[PDB]
C-alpha cells in the first residue's frame, strides 16, 4: 500500500513504524526501566532544589554549564591535525577566497581594459 | 487500569488546595483600588493649519527652488486669465 | 440586557441586524440591476466588432492577378 | 516515555491507534453523518479480530494497521485550538505572570491592595510553616535508594498538605 | 482590491471572534441565518470577486484581462490568467459553501452576539465602499492610456464564461 | 467571551450528553457510576465517550490520562483543572 | 586643545581627595562638565583643519570621535559599579583614576600632529585596558584574554615604528600637512610593498581583520563592562582613524597591492556574520558583530573614494554607539542572572517591561533602521563599493540579510516567549540602567536629525 | 483566433511577421490614394499636456472631452457624448489598422503565391 | 448559574440524513451507531437550511420592486 517510509536526516522516523519496538526483549525492558529511573532521580533532585522558599537564585544546572564548557573551550583541546581535517580546512578556507579573488581579477581586468579603451558610458558618471 | 488510591487521594488534596486558592484569588474589598487624591476639532483643524500655512508662505518664499507645480493645462477653446487673450479655437472636425 | 446563550437551540435574533442585512443585499441587487440597465451593455463592447477586415478583394488595394 | 511506567502496553497502542484514526477521519470527512457511518465502519473493522489469543498475530496486525493508517492519514488534522500545535499553543501567554513576582512592588501599591496581600501573607506562612520537617521526612521516608517512578505519595500519615505542592497549586488561570 | 478584501478580512474576523477563536473551516460548517449581516457581507465579498457584471470587481479585473488579451502576450500567461480566474471562482464558491451553506457544525453553548455599534458601522461602511467606490474611482480619472474597446466575439465573453463554469 | 461555568452545571452537561448516548440507561446512572465495572462497557466505547467529551468542550486530554477516568466525577475534576471553574 | 586636556589631569586628584560615598558624584559631575567643554570644540570650517598650536590639530574626522569619547566616559563611569561597588575604597579610586588616565591617552591619541606622538599615545592607550580587564575580567580565562590581547597588538603594531622612523629620516618631519604638501608618489618596488604591508598590517591587527579576529572575543566575554566598551568603541574606531590618517601616503602602490586585504575582509565579513548566528555566550555575538562591521569598514578604507570615507566615519561613530549600548544591555542581563549564556534566561517580556523597548531600539539600530546613522554609513559604503566593482553588492547585501538575521535572532531569543519559572530572583529595573539607556539613544537620534556634523573631511 | 493556429501550423509566408509589417511598396495599386488630414493642432497638442502614445489621430475628441470634463466637475456623469465620439473615432482607427493588416496580408498571399507558383 | 436545560428524550432521532444513514447501516448489518448527539444540529431552526443559489438570490426581495420603481419613475 504505502512505500514503507524511507528515512533521511530531515524526514524523522515516527513512533509507529520503528519497527524495532516490536522486538521486545528483557534487555530493552531493562534499558527503558533504567532510563525511567534516571529521569525519575533527576526530576526528584530538581523538585527538591526547586520548591524551597528560602532558595533565592537560579537552579544552577550543571548539565547546561557542561554543554557550554564542552562547546566553547573544549574545542581546541582535544585535537590532532590529521589528513581529513587539514584537507577540509584548506577546502573551506582558501578555496572560496581564491575563487572570489579570481573573479575580482576578471571583473577588474575587464573594467580596466574597457576604460583604457575609453568606451564607457561616462558622459556623466560623477559619484564614483 | 485506573487510578491508584495514591492518585485518588493526592489529586483530591490538590483539589482542596487549588479550589481554596482560586476561592481566594477573586479580589473583593468591594472597591478594587483607591486613589491617593468640539475643542479637539478646533485645535486639530486650526492650529496645525495655521502653523503649516505660516511655514508654507514665508520660508518657502525664502528658499527659491522649493514647492513647484506641474502646469495647469490650457485648451484651444480657453483664454488666459492673467493678461487676457484667447487661444484661437480648435480647427475643423470633419469625418465624424 | 445583551443577548443570552441557549444550549443546542437556534439563537435568538433582533429585527435590526436582519433588516440591515436584507436591505444591504437588496441595495447591491438594485445597484447591479440599474447599472446593467442604464448604460451598459457591458457584455457587448458597445460597437460591432467587424469581420476580417471586410472580406472584399479589389477594395483595400490589390493588383489584377 | 511516560512518568508512571517504562512502556505503555500493546492495548494502549491499539487504543491510541483507534483515537488517532477517529480524529484523522474527522479531519478527512465533512458533513459529520457520513463521517458517523465511516466511524462505525472503522469500529466494525476493529471488531474483525478482537478475539485473538495469539500475540505475534496481534502485534503483526497492529503493525499492518499502522501501515494502513499512515497510508490514509490527512496532512492537516483537526487539532483542537487549545492544544499545542493548533491555534492556541498558549495563545494568551502575554499575561501568565507567575506569583514569585507581585511581591516586588512598592508599599504604596501594597497599600492599595491590603486584604489580598494580607491573605498572601497567610498563604506564605502556610508554605513556610511545615515546609522543612514534614516534607523532608516524607521524601526521605518512602522510596528505596532507587526512586524508579516519577509520582509521589500524598500526606496520608496525620496532618498537613501533600508534599511538593507549591508550583502546582500556584499557577496562571489559563485565561488571563 | 484594498476596499474589497479589507471588508472581507474584517467580516471573517468577526465570525472567528463569534465562535470562540477556533478559526478553522471544519467545525464552522453552516452559519447562514446566524445573523445574516455577516453572511450577507461575506457573500457580497465572495461574489464581487471575479466581477459581478458590472460592479467594482468587474472594472479592474475585466479591463486587465481584456487589455492582456489584446496585447503581445507570452503565449502561456493568457492561459495562466484564465485557469487562475477559474480557480479563484471555485475556491470562492467552496469557501461560501463550507463556511455558511452546509450542515451546521460548531460546538454547543453558542455565544453568537453582534449587539454592537462598532461592528455594524465598520462592516456597513465598507460594504457601502464595496458598492460605490469602484465606480466613483473608475469615472473621474484622466485616461492616461489608449483604451482598446474593440474586442472580438468569444473574447470579452470568455471571462464571465470561465467564472460561471 | 467566557460564560460563567459552575461545577454543578458542567456536571449536569457531562451527565446529560452521556444520557443522550444510547446503549446506557438513564435509570441506573449517577455521578458515582463506573465505566468498566457496573455498566460493563468496554475500553473502546470508553474512548468513544472521551471523544464525545473532547468534541463537546473543544480540547483534547492527554493519553497519560486516557486509561484512568472511569467515572463522571473525575471527569469533572479534570475539566475543572482545565478551565478553573470558579469566580 | 590643552584647555581640553589639563582639566583631565586636574580631574585625577579629585577622585583621591574625595572622601567616602563622595567620589561617585564628583567624578560623574565633572566628567559631564568636560563633556560640555568638549561640545564647545566644534568650530571647524571650510578650507583647512583647525590647529591647536604647534603640538596639536584636528581634522573634521578626529573631532566627532573625540566628542564621542568624552561623551562616552561618564556613561562608562556610571556603568562600572555593582560588581565593584562593594570593593575597597583605595582600589575603587585606583580603578576610577585608571579610567581617567585611559581617557587622557585616548584624547592624546586622537589629537596628534606627528605619527610618532600618535604611536606613543597609541600604545599608551593600549596599556591601562590590559590592567583593567585582567584584574576585573570575572572569568577563569581573563589571563589568556589579556595575554593574547597585548601580544597580538604589540606584535602587529611594532613594524609601524620602524616604518615611521624611516619616513621621518628620509622625507623631513611628520606634520600631517608636511607629510602632505610634499609626498612624492613612491613607485612599485618590493621595499615599498613591505613598508605598506608593515603600516597597513599593524592597523589590520588593530581593526581586527578576519585573519586576526580571535584577538577580540575572549577580551570581551572575559572582561568587565568598562574595558569592554572602551575596547570595542574607542580602540577599534581609534585604529580606524589611525589608518584614515596614514593612508595619505603610498597611493600608486595600494591599487596593485590592496586586492587581497579587500578579499579577506569581505569573506571574513560573510563568515563572521555566519559565525555569530548560532553561538551561545550572548556577550560574544556583539563582539563578532563588531568584527563584521569593522571588516566592512576596512573594505571602505582600502577603497579610496570620498563617498567611502563619509560612509566609513558614519559607520564608525554609529557602530560605536550601538555596540556600547548593546554591551551595556548584556551587562544588565548578566547582573540579573549570573549565567552569561543565551538559551537559559528567556522570557523577560512580562518582567522588565520597558527594558524590552531598549532591546528593541538597540536591535533596530543594529538592524540599520534607515533614518539612523548606521544605515547612512552602510549605504554609502555599499554605493562606493559598487562603484569600485560591479559584483561585490551580493556580498554586501548577504552581510545585510545575515546581519538582520542574527541581530533579530538575538532579540527574539533571549527576550521573547517564556520565562523558565525557575529563575525567581530578578528584581525590576533600576533607574540607573534606564538612565544609561537614555544616555545612549538620545545622541544617536539627535545625530539622525542633524547628520552634517559626523561626515568626514571629504564632506 | 484561428490565424494563430495558421501561423503555428502552416507556412510562415502568408502569415505576416509581426511588428515588421511595412513589407511591400506603398501606393502599390492605390495611385493617388492619400490625404492624411491631421487637423489635431500640433502646437495646441503641446499646449494640452497629453500622454505619449496619445499624440496621434482622433486627438481633438480627447481635447473636447477633457475640456468638458474640466468644465463640468459637479456634473459627475454628463460628459458621455464626446466620450463615445472619441470611442467611435478610435474604433474607426482600429478598423483602419485591421484593413491595413489584411491589405499587407492579402498582397503577400495573392502576389507571392502567384509569382512563386506561376514562375 | 442556572441554564433550565433544554433537555433529552425530545429528539427521538427522526432527522432525515441520520435516519437514512441508519437505514444504510442497518441494511449493511451493523445497526449500532453512536446516536442522537446531533439532532439539534439537524433539526430545530435548522432543517431546510437554504440551498446554494438561494443564498446568492437572497437579495431580490426589495431589489426587483425598486428596479421597477426606478424604471417607471
UniProtKB/Swiss-Prot annotation, chain E:
Membrane-spanning regions, if any?
1-16, 35-55, 82-102, 126-146
**What protein does this entry describe?**
NADH-ubiquinone oxidoreductase chain 5
Into which family does the record put it?
Belongs to the complex I subunit 5 family.
| Gene expressing this chain | MT-ND5
Signal sequence, start to end: none
Q: State the protein's purpose.
A: Core subunit of the mitochondrial membrane respiratory chain NADH dehydrogenase (Complex I) which catalyzes electron transfer from NADH through the respiratory chain, using ubiquinone as an electron acceptor. Essential for the catalytic activity and assembly of complex I.
Record lineage: Eukaryota, Metazoa, Chordata, Craniata, Vertebrata
How does this protein assemble?
A: Core subunit of respiratory chain NADH dehydrogenase (Complex I) which is composed of 45 different subunits.
Q: Where in the cell is it found?
A: Mitochondrion inner membrane
**Disulphide linkage map:** none
From Swiss-Prot, chain G:
Q: Name one GO biological process term.
A: electron transport coupled proton transport
A GO term from the CC aspect: mitochondrial inner membrane
Keywords in UniProt for this one? Electron transport, Membrane, Mitochondrion, Mitochondrion inner membrane, NAD, Respiratory chain, Translocase, Transmembrane, Transmembrane helix, Transport, Ubiquinone
Localization (cell) = Mitochondrion inner membrane
The record gives the membrane topology as: Multi-pass membrane protein
Name where it mostly resides. mitochondrion
**InterPro entries assigned:** NADH4_N (IPR000260), NADH_Q_OxRdtase_chainM/4 (IPR010227), NADH_UbQ_OxRdtase (IPR003918), ND/Mrp_TM (IPR001750)
Instruction: Tell me the GO molecular function terms.
Output: NADH dehydrogenase (ubiquinone) activity; ubiquinone binding
Name the residues that span the membrane.
Answer: 22-42, 60-80, 98-118, 147-167, 196-216, 224-244, 256-276, 284-303, 308-330, 351-371, 391-411
User: Which Pfam families did the record assign?
Assistant: Oxidored_q5_N (PF01059), Proton_antipo_M (PF00361)
Does the record carry Electron transport as a key word?
Answer: yes
Q: Which EC main class describes this enzyme?
A: translocase
EC number(s) on file: 7.1.1.2
Catalytic activity reads: a ubiquinone + NADH + 5 H(+)(in) = a ubiquinol + NAD(+) + 4 H(+)(out)
Give the function comment from the record.
Core subunit of the mitochondrial membrane respiratory chain NADH dehydrogenase (Complex I) which catalyzes electron transfer from NADH through the respiratory chain, using ubiquinone as an electron acceptor. Essential for the catalytic activity and assembly of complex I.
Q: PANTHER family in the record, alphabetically?
A: NADH-UBIQUINONE OXIDOREDUCTASE CHAIN 4 (PTHR43507:SF20)
Listed under subunit, the entry gives: Core subunit of respiratory chain NADH dehydrogenase (Complex I) which is composed of 45 different subunits.
Q: Which family does it belong to?
A: Belongs to the complex I subunit 4 family.
Q: What is this protein called?
A: NADH-ubiquinone oxidoreductase chain 4
The organism encoding this protein is: Ovis aries (Sheep)
Which lineage is the organism of this entry classified under, starting from the top rank? Answer: Eukaryota, Metazoa, Chordata, Craniata, Vertebrata
